[PDB]
Design a binder for this molecule. Structure first.
Ligand SMILES: [Mg+2]
Ligand SMILES: [Mg+2]
Ligand SMILES: [Mg+2]
Ligand SMILES: [Mg+2]
Ligand SMILES: [Mg+2]
Ligand SMILES: [Mg+2]
Ligand SMILES: [Mg+2]
Ligand SMILES: [Mg+2]
Ligand SMILES: [Mg+2]
Ligand SMILES: [Mg+2]
Ligand SMILES: [Mg+2]
Ligand SMILES: [Mg+2]
Ligand SMILES: [Mg+2]
Ligand SMILES: [Mg+2]
Ligand SMILES: [Mg+2]
Ligand SMILES: [Mg+2]
Ligand SMILES: [Mg+2]
Ligand SMILES: [Mg+2]
Ligand SMILES: [Mg+2]
Ligand SMILES: [Mg+2]
Lengths: 60, 70, 145, 80, 63, 143, 55, 206, 67, 141
RNA sequence: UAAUUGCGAUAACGAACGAGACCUUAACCUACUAAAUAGUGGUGCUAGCAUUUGCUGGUUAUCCACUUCUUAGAGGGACUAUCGGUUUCAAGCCGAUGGAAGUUUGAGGCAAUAACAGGUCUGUGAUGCCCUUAGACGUUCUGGGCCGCACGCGCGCUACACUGACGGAGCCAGCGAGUCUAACCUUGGCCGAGAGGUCUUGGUAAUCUUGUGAAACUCCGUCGUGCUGGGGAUAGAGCAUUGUAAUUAUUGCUCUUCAACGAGGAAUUCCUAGUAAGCGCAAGUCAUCAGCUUGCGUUGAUUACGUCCCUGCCCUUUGUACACACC
């Protein structure tokens, strides 16, 4: 959870009110053993605005 | 500076003959007998235990506590 | 540790290094009433002089005291380091001293003078009876003088 | 070629805050009465079938002293 | 020195402008069948036991 | 029965080992000990003077025995505590890595600890050995 | 220069200390105007036409 | 008591006194009775306990305060004055010591002696600032049991805390001495003096 | 304070009005009835509601209730 | 495998897991006997279940406790809990009900929340004070 | 009632905004879907002690099984439930039981209409008008200044010690954050009294720093009421780090120097449970600098559970020649 904690006032007067924004980062991973074909079939599609898909290979 | 810090010969004899009758004996008790500062009082507690008189019925730092032998 | 006895051996108050030291205070801290011997310094001098730090100032054989002073005013020979010392790197002969007793009063004045005499700000600032380490002087320190 | 733009109309602007704000701006700037400009906006948003809508104009018209107005119609909730 | 013990029955309420004081009716056990209203300082509930230092001078309102 | 060292109260153990290392003679004690301080966050040196190097070594050993591996950087943190910054609030401060590193080097020459892969210092088989022994010694004083 | 700065008597803590403290030091906020917040000073005025014509 | 051994073993005084009677650090909760009517129901004792430490939800209701064991109340109250806020381990040990000390003097269950000083220092009646017109006199009141217990604890500990401040006697002895002197009010104890002086004034405005 | 809002109390009325046969002195089943028979947008509000239609049910059995 | 259950205990942010297998009566915590636990003044707080229910009763089992998180008191309240729960967990699956219940009767009738974890938790600080309720000082003039 | 929250009375009836609902976070799931970036039991390989099986460790994969603990999806859970007392037996309040949980479950987010000449043109390439515009009020470069010290006022930090200081030893969190066209978080190894230095290393991170082995705290010792070894201001002399730059001492370390302060007048602040108080840590700022803040967990109380005396506000009644509304 990404927190930013600012004063509300753009200046300085007033009882010092504080406010905290937060951006929630959700991260998942799924492990698959598959041939070459399905991988691209599975990566090109299921694509979504908002979700960041990243595919790594290899055992290290 | 105001007394109780050394071992004035008569003092040791005071420490042997004047310590029955103490239902309670500890560091504070030893200082209260117009004698011995806490330090040599603490050395006394150990060396009054060299043999008897005091029964060790409590542990440690800050607090000691002792009772007359039987 | 032990119960001791002693005759008339130990004397209360003893005067070494032109200053008075009370007996019946543990010899390490007893030593500190000398100008230029803080707790650390005394502790090491005593450890270096082959003395028992269970002993008061009062006890101590003349010889033992003899040693202590000797080491105190030559800390370099008797393998006390130098980073242990209040005047490393003089500024004239640039040797490494450890200035003690009546002498530290002098040497403070010596330095305070060298600054004033060379007209450097810290000196001027000293001459004025002000704070010299750069602290804000608006709100703090108003009794003094 | 590794970046690509595509324009696209919006399914009825009437339910878009941002669209209707920029409309007002254009109403006043093109020189319309204030209540006229505000009311037509409210009565088109409503017309585009909203549950409710409110328009504030704060600032100064002609007089030196500044004022505000609320132009509202139909239903709104304000919390949670 | 006479001790006089009374058992609290019914909490009456708060007096004293501040309100720390609570009115209450009691019944002494050493010869019952006789009620008195007292003023208390501490927190009180029913069946608590009060030591009346003197046994006959009940009070009322407190400013 | 058969014993470990975990079967022994920390202070009862460490003093028992302490005594032993002194009672022994095999060591390597820096020599700056008696003038050094243990941490920049301290005020006075140890009051054990002759000794206490045996104490930390004992402590240091027992610690490493109780874990996989540990280095100078961690011991410096273990042994350090609060430091009065005079009139400014307290702050934790690490202890000195000279004392520690030298303690690890000593214990190893004496063969109670060895270097470890991955990193740091690992308990040694010959440490396991002798620690489990004196622990057993310490439990048999209460028999 | 600096030579002057030390040579200059009438300086340093000693001197100030022996000088009485002014009373502007122990004063107030002064405030000056705030009970006139609502009473407009412009002397001008809008008018019921120009306001109607705009709002 | 018939002993019992398993792998990692439990010591003799441990096995013995425990399973048998459910007694304190090692003092008896049985016997130990509240010599003043009332104060019972407000001086706990039974359920018995090993030490005076307890993650107890004793605040969230008005009178549940009273169900806490009166020893652990006493120790709870030692741990204050800024520097000592929290520090219950500190406190707990002081009591364990205090009790041992008290035990040495005059025998008696030390926890019982605590009971006596507690009862014996609670103002049977007091006073409060009533209006009546600016010139505010003092109306006499009869103080509740709870206020009588509470106040006793505060008064007892406080007197000792002040005795303990700035002298060689340890905080455990000053507590002990206050307690003992208050076990039957010798009027040489800070608590009784203040109790009795409270009831003096309470009487003279009636 | 645990005084129920109007939405709840109003929903209890309306329910008891048209489903008195079915419903019960028991909340747990009264709970479940609500899911079937009525639409609510939160678990909380549904409980809220049913616990009160339960309460109302519970003292109807011992004489009428106004409204 | 032998008969075995795992339990845990919590207090503040401490969490103390226990394993109560069948064995010859050991009672270790983190890898040392329960007799070595420390803060020492509170040792009888974690002995507490054992004596509450009869120092035997453990002769057919082994206990290992592993406390991570929390602090130097909360860990003691967490380990005692997991012990007592472990004893009731086991009987529930391997002994019989009555045995289990009698055991719960002893703990509850005494209790420092032995079977049941304290819901108490730290309330968040809010701006304007160094505390959660505590407020920064003010002056007016 | 926390609530124009409801009950009830009732020329009103039935509703909408705001309150509530809702949302977020902290609490309960041996029920569900899983996990070599979390972890457990078993087994191989292996060390130490005991040996009679035992006890305590090692081994980012030598295999097997599980999901209790950790993680986060989906659900479930509580609705002041059951019972009781009280009340116009109305809404409700109170107690006992059970329960993870029964003070709006705890804490927040959101939050109507209206008022103010509240603050902000010094956040804005938001902005009207006035001013200025080449000897500039544009801009940049060098240097000083915002820190300047008879003094008044506020927030704070550290203290006056023995429920303590010091020295050894025990030894436990939670919220975070970290390096690409770069030099961020730093383990480990050596060197160094320390601060630091140096050689390497892991991590764009549940993977490495880090179990952030934090501090109060606990234990065994020294000291022994003495301005004492409480306290650490002020000042001297040296060593290092950041930076182009440290003088008016950035900060860090070492020796020395060793002030006031012995619980604080009139006054005044904050606070009701994991709260107050004590105690540290991460984050913002940040080249370097926290005695500040925002959050975090650790230790953990005393005392109410009331009232209208003080102070502040809200409501009704009432007067008004005010309505730019007692400025
Ligand atoms: Mg000196
Ligand atoms: Mg400065
Ligand atoms: Mg709403
Ligand atoms: Mg809301
Ligand atoms: Mg330490
Ligand atoms: Mg530490
Ligand atoms: Mg402190
Ligand atoms: Mg699970
Ligand atoms: Mg209950
Ligand atoms: Mg203005
Ligand atoms: Mg602006
Ligand atoms: Mg400024
Ligand atoms: Mg402020
Ligand atoms: Mg310490
Ligand atoms: Mg060097
Ligand atoms: Mg790399
Ligand atoms: Mg001094
Ligand atoms: Mg100091
Ligand atoms: Mg920072
Ligand atoms: Mg600031």
């Amino acid at each position: 959870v990404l927190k930013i904690s600012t004063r509300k006032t753009p200046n300085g007067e007033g009882s010092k009110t504080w406010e905290t924004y937060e951006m929630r980062i959700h991260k998942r991973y799924i492990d698959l053993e598959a041939p070459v074909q399905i991988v691209k079939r599975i990566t090109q599609i299921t694509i979504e605005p908002g979700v960041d898909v990243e595919v790594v290979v290899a055992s290290n | 500076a105001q007394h109780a810090v050394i071992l004035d010969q008569e003092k040791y004899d005071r420490i042997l003959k004047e310590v029955p009758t103490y239902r309670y004996v500890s560091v504070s008790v030893l200082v209260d007998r117009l004698k011995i500062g806490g330090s040599l009082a603490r050395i006394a507690l150990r060396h009054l235990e060299k043999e008897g008189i005091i029964k060790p019925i409590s542990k440690h730092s800050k607090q000691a506590i002792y009772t007359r032998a039987t | 540790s032990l119960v001791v006895q002693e005759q008339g051996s130990f004397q209360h108050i003893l005067r070494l290094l032109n200053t008075n030291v009370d007996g019946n205070i543990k010899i390490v801290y007893a030593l500190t009433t000398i100008k230029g011997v803080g707790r650390r310094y005394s502790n090491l001098v005593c450890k270096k002089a082959d003395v028992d730090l269970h002993k008061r100032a009062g006890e101590l054989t003349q010889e033992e005291l003899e040693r202590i002073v000797q080491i105190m005013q030559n800390p370099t020979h008797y393998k006390i380091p130098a980073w242990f010392l209040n005047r490393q790197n003089d500024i004239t002969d640039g040797k490494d001293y450890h200035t003690l007793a009546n002498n530290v009063e002098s040497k403070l004045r010596d330095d305070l003078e060298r600054l004033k005499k060379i007209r450097a700000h810290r000196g001027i600032r000293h001459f004025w009876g002000l704070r010299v380490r750069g602290q804000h002087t608006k709100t703090t320190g108003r009794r003094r003088a | 070629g590794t970046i690509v733009l595509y324009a696209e109309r919006v399914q009825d602007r009437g339910l878009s805050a941002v669209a209707q704000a920029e409309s007002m701006k254009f109403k006043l700037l093109n020189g319309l009465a204030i209540r006229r400009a505000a009311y037509g906006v409210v009565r088109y948003v409503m017309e585009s079938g909203a549950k409710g809508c409110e328009v504030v104009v704060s600032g100064k018209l002609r007089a030196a002293r500044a004022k505000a107005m609320k132009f509202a119609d139909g239903f709104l909730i304000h919390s949670g | 020195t006479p001790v006089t013990l009374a058992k609290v029955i019914k909490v009456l309420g708060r007096t004293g402008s501040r309100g720390g004081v609570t009115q209450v009716r009691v019944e002494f056990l050493e010869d019952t069948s006789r009620t008195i209203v007292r003023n208390v300082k501490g927190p009180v509930r029913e069946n608590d036991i009060l030591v009346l230092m003197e046994s006959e001078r009940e009070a009322r309102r407190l400013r | 029965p058969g014993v470990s060292v975990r079967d022994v109260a920390a202070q009862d153990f460490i003093n028992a080992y302490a005594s032993f290392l002194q009672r022994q003679g095999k060591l390597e004690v820096p020599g700056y000990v008696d003038i050094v301080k243990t941490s920049s966050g301290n005020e006075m040196p140890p009051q054990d003077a002759e000794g206490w190097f045996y104490k930390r070594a004992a402590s240091v050993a027992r610690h490493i025995y109780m874990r996989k591996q540990v280095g100078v950087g961690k011991l410096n943190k273990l042994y350090g505590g609060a430091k009065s910054r005079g009139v400014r609030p307290y702050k934790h401060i690490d202890a000195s890595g000279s004392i520690n590193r030298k303690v690890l080097q000593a214990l190893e020459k004496i063969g109670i600890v060895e270097i470890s892969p991955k990193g740091g210092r690992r308990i040694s088989e010959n440490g396991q050995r002798d620690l489990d022994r004196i622990a057993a010694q310490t439990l048999e004083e209460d028999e | 220069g600096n030579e002057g700065a030390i040579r200059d008597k009438t300086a340093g803590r000693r001197n100030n200390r022996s000088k009485d403290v002014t009373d502007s030091a122990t004063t107030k906020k002064s405030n000056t105007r705030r009970a006139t917040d609502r009473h407009s000073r412009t002397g001008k005025t809008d008018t019921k036409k120009k306001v109607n014509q705009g709002w | 008591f018939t002993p019992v051994v398993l792998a990692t073993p439990i010591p003799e005084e441990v096995q013995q006194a425990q399973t048998e009677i459910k007694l304190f650090n090692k003092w008896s909760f049985e016997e130990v009775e509240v010599k003043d009517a009332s104060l019972v129901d407000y001086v706990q004792v039974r359920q018995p306990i090993f030490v005076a430490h307890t993650a107890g939800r004793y605040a969230n209701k008005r009178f549940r305060k009273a169900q806490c064991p009166i020893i652990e109340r006493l120790t709870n109250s030692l741990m204050m004055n800024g520097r000592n806020n929290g520090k219950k381990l500190k406190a707990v040990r002081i009591i364990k010591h205090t009790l041992d000390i008290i035990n040495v003097l005059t025998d008696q269950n030390p926890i019982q002696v605590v009971v006596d000083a507690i009862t014996n220092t609670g103002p049977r009646e007091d006073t409060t600032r009533v209006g009546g017109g600016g010139a505010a006199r003092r109306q006499a009141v009869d103080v509740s049991p709870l206020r009588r217990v509470n106040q006793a604890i505060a008064l007892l500990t406080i007197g000792a805390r002040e005795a303990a401040f700035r002298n060689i006697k340890t905080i455990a002895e000053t507590l002990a001495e206050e307690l003992i002197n208050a076990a039957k009010g010798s009027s040489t104890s800070y608590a009784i003096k203040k109790k009795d002086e409270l009831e003096r004034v309470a009487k003279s405005n009636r | 304070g645990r005084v129920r809002t109007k939405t709840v109390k109003r929903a209890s009325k309306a329910l008891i009005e048209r489903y008195y046969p079915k419903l019960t002195l028991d909340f747990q089943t009264n709970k479940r009835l609500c899911d079937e028979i009525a639409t609510i947008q939160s678990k909380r509000l549904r409980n809220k509601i049913a616990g009160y239609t339960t309460h109302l049910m519970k003292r109807i059995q011992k004489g009428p209730v106004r409204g | 495998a032998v008969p075995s259950v795992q339990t845990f205990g919590k207090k503040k942010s401490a969490t103390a897991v226990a394993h109560v297998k069948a064995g010859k009566g050991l009672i270790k915590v983190n890898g040392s006997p329960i007799t070595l636990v420390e803060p020492e003044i509170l040792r009888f707080k974690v002995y507490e279940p054992l004596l509450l229910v009869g120092l035997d009763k453990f002769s057919n089992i082994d206990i290992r406790v592993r406390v991570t998180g929390g602090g130097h008191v909360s860990q003691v309240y967490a380990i005692r809990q997991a012990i007592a729960k472990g004893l009731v967990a086991y009987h529930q699956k391997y002994v019989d009900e009555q045995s289990k219940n009698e055991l719960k009767k002893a703990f509850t009738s005494y209790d420092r929340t032995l079977l049941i974890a304290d819901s108490r938790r730290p309330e968040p600080k809010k701006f304007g004070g160094k505390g959660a309720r505590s407020r920064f000082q003010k002056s007016y003039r």
